[model samples]
Target chain A: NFFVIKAKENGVNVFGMTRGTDTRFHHSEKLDKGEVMIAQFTEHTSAVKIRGKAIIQTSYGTLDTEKDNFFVIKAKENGVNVFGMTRGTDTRFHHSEKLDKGEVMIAQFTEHTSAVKIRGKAIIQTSYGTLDTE
Target chain B: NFFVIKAKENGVNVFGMTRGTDTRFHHSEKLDKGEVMIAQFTEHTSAVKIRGKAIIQTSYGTLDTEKDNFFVIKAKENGVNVFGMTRGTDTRFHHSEKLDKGEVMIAQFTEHTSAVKIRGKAIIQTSYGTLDTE
Candidate 1:
């Protein structure tokens, strides 16, 4: 199973983690607003991880991860989602507040998979600056 | 270092650290947007914590973490700054106010401090997308 994590911002991204002879977060990296990473945990693998802070997207469904790190927000179930090592706890997540004249959402999952979808005139935080509606 | 906080995101991002072994934060990891964790006695080699909303910057001027768990809407601090737990706390950090003709303000704390500077036309949000901004 391969999952992707793209850097919606210079996101300090993360991705592709498995239980090999390497480290726990060996695949995690720093990506720009449009970068991507890949990972998986299959019959030959076990645990994996995702990333956060930057707006993010997923590919697999329940394997890739969320956007923020702890929480995952969205409209009609959209927004940044950062789902990491949350084993069994009642934690809160983070996210933007509005959809500004129909702002757009961003996502980056893997280097080889997953992508995000937007709807309005919103800016992506791949290293924030300013904007004027999509 | 009782800091084995995997699902990083608060302070937006951080780990279990130490002085003799504490903080500064000791164990600051917001884990979620608007979510704040624990630190130490300021001058204690104890445990720490971190927190945030989107891709957040730091301040001790710079000591904790990153990865936009705190969304910083750009162009002259025209984003959302919820700075409150909300409710009786008066929720309302919603942004997207339009820094049209080019607005800008920057704040990055710590290095070890103040490490958040970008030159582009992007968007920033720290878990502001769905909640209230505050």
Candidate 2:
């Protein structure tokens, strides 16, 4: 399922996704609660945590993380380690009060793998629509 | 009949004709004469005195003359009187020591009439041949 937040300045909607089948969530304003969110690729086997402050509890290692950054939760199954992180613009990460400035991320995965994930209040403007993820 | 004078300088024969039918005359050297000579045209009645210094005793007037210059002897039958005069080059006339320089003459006669005449040591260069007359 996807989580959405309306940008207070521009009225553009930001959204987030969960890794399970048919999971649904929504945020009309900025996300204040520290909630863990999951990211899933519909056409691939890889999954990731998208929002909130959560440690990447992986079999490889415990990757202690904050909000608004990206990580590869399943490295060996996805064919690579962590793809990218700290990638968004005009938003702020919780706990680390610094505004996430010019933080853009891109990654290429192997066949049947997740390409990207957005954590915290990462704003993504895509052709389908614009959304701010939890 | 007419007299002729040969050009001693170039060996080109200069010839003259008397104003009559079948009346011919010849000269091998330069003419040193004061005799009167007549000019005739086979195709017309217009005739003139061509060579030798003599008085042009015509019913119109007594025209004083010299050698090596053209004059018209008859007017009505030819439709013009005394067409031209003093017309030859490169030869000297008697009683005049000056070489007749650039003395070229041209005249137009009426229909069925003659056009020109060469007098004294006038060297005439024609397509047929070259001749000098007295």
Candidate 3:
């Protein structure tokens, strides 16, 4: 069986898969759950993870590994209303709200989770109101 | 006899006077003690005071009436190491240090005081290091 996992951050969403055929894992074009993922990880998970961590270097600095707990599924910078979900009989949505430009969100999947899905418009909430990225 | 007062904020110095001869009061262009000065005021001083208070509106908003306290003598934005003085023999320099950008400094003139002077560069401190205005 094949399943897709989606995550979001700052209004962006990235896709991953439980099946081992995604190119993000094999440097091809498909998305793999344990290979190519975008998120920030803390120190605890940096040492043990084998396949889910890929550090990307940007002009600001080297991106850190996206740990399981504190990772956000983001796409374009400054996207808003992004979210993630796991495949299960009871896919409960928790902590859904309008987020500011620099705010963060986190979601988790328990044991035997297969897929995650997401959907939202890219509008960042600010002190004044929601703003679209320009 | 005439005296001058000066103040500073965010590394900029502004001059004032106690004798009231300057046109910041008269609208001409001679430096006066009670007119045409720059500083920010709070709610307490905004209601009282007549001759020593003038409000200038900027693009950001209407400049608030500069109160006696919480005012700075700024010439150029983002100046660093700015200071102010009063006409006292014991003009003790306190809290002198290289400040980063967007930082603030304050000085006070007690009863029967005059003239304030300042000298320094216009740099502001940041989390990483001091930064010059670009």
Candidate 4:
């Protein structure tokens, strides 16, 4: 699984823990204010430890952050396209992806991303609730 | 963002809702026992309607399905590899992915999917809690 970690203040510290009978710190990161980091779990990784002010986000919910929202999309069929819109006065597509059946993509607003655009059928999960696209 | 919809019992109905001031059904599907269908949301879709017994899985949690668990993986570094193991007497890697940094992938155990393996640093989210890969 994954977490969307956002720094709320300066000097947020993140530590990755190792797996097995005896878990220990294996990796670490430092996030300045407004910085975002997406982390994932691997076979050797067991837990994560965080210190300082930051928003830790999971499917369950968000601990809070600027913009304070994120979304997950699952493609119901092949060729479901998703476009990430850039922020600013002149918004444009900054990134895109084509998802096939059973593929899931999690996204959120960022310093350079203002909105997300989708085409075709999919499922969307947000802080508000789970929704479906026709 | 996405949902792993699994049919808990036979004749589970799934209906896609349209987006607009006035929402209406736009598409529908019926899943029989042990069937799995991934659904998504789009600009034109607003909601999903379900009837009968089924497991509706979102990042938040699960509605309970056979296997009853799933995982989400987000890559922290480039070229993080993911391997999906096949179920049956002879288990083998059936699917694989190479994720770049900031990429997210959601996965679950299915009739044909038994385990998932990962290589490289990442974050994993599950019902228990958020974890990290070493």
Candidate 3 chain A: worst-modelled 10 consecutive residues by lDDT: A42-51
Order the candidates by lDDT, highest first.
4, 1, 3, 2
Q: Flag the better candidate by lDDT, 3 or 4.
A: 4
Model 4 residue A17 CA deviation (Å) reads: 51
For A32-83, candidate 2 gives per-residue lDDT tens digits of 2222211222222222222323232222222332333123221111112222
* Candidate 2 wrong stretches, greater than 4 Å: A1-134, B1-41, B44-52, B66-109, B112-134
Give the candidates in order of DockQ, highest first.
Answer: 4, 1, 3, 2
Which segments of candidate 4 are over 4 A away from where they belong?
A: A1-134, B1-58, B61-68
**Residue by residue across A35-119, what tens digits does model 1's lDDT show?**
4333323322243333443333333122122321111223323342322221224332222123322122232232222223344
Give a tens-digit lDDT track for model 4, residues A3-75.
8877778887766645433435676677889989887666555445565566666875654322214456556
Model 1: per-residue Cα lDDT over B73-108, one tens digit each: 332233322111111112222221223212222221
TM-score of chain B of 1: 0.20
Interface RMSDs of the predictions, in order, are 16.5, 65.5, 25.4, 11.5
Give stretches of model 1 more than 4 Å off.
Answer: A15-23, A42-45, A55-134, B1-134
Q: What TM-score does structure 3 among the candidates reach? A: 0.18
Question: To one decimal place, how large is model 3's interface RMSD in Å?
Answer: 25.4
Per-residue lDDT of B118 in model 2? 25
RMSD of each: 19.2, 54.7, 22.4, 21.7
The interface RMSD value for candidate 2 stands at 65.5
Kindly list the per-residue Cα lDDT of model 3 for residues A1-134, writing each as its tens digit.
11122322222333223321111211223334334344433221211112222433322223333531212322222334432222233333332234333333332332322222222322222112222222
* Top TM-score prediction, candidate number: 4
Model 3 off-target regions past 4 Å?
A: A1-134, B1-79, B84-87, B91-98, B104-113, B123-134
Model 4, span B38-102: residue lDDT tens: 43444444345555566666665554322215566656677888776666787678655576564
